[PDB]
């Protein structure tokens, strides 16, 4: 599914992301916008053969097992395929582990380049 902005904001809030590990809800909405354009089925292949999966573009090099990425660590203990659901639970649970790993939201390239530094709460304005 393709979420609307406030629809996703409300779903992420229900799933506990607002202010999680210090990151306000707008950070997470901005991240999803620029990672997947709000599409839970988005996937993008990386140079190193790893792939990003789902609404938050979780990378199989470190976080999930897709059976085809060498150097797999599968730190979220989840098949990458499971992150392509219209229900955001599995992606949120992995996201919580990523942001706790000790480096903020910097793991998300789109967030680090295109959200970090901006007025992120604009992404939940009107919701």
Swiss-Prot record:
GO cellular component terms attached to this protein's record: cytoplasm; endoplasmic reticulum; extracellular space
MF (Gene Ontology): beta-N-acetylglucosaminidase activity; identical protein binding; lysozyme activity
Location(s) in or outside the cell: Secreted
Expression (tissue specificity): In the egg white and polymorphonuclear leukocytes.
PROSITE patterns: GLYCOSYL_HYDROL_F22_1, GLYCOSYL_HYDROL_F22_2
One Pfam family per UniProt: Lys
Assigned protein family: Belongs to the glycosyl hydrolase 22 family.
Subunit structure, interactors included: Monomer.
Designated name of the protein: Lysozyme C
């Amino acid at each position: 599914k393709v979420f609307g902005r406030c629809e996703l904001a409300a779903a992420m809030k229900r799933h506990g992301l607002d202010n999680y590990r210090g990151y306000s809800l707008g950070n997470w909405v901005c991240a999803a916008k620029f990672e997947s354009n709000f599409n839970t089925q988005a996937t993008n292949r990386n140079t190193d053969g790893s792939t990003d999966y789902g609404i938050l573009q979780i990378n199989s090099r470190w976080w999930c097992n897709d059976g085809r990425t060498p150097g797999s660590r599968n730190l979220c203990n989840i098949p990458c395929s499971a992150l392509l659901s219209s229900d955001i639970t599995a992606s949120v649970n992995c996201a919580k582990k990523i942001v706790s790993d000790g480096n903020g939201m910097n793991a998300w390239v789109a967030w680090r380049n295109r959200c970090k530094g901006t007025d992120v709460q604009a992404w939940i304005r009107g919701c």
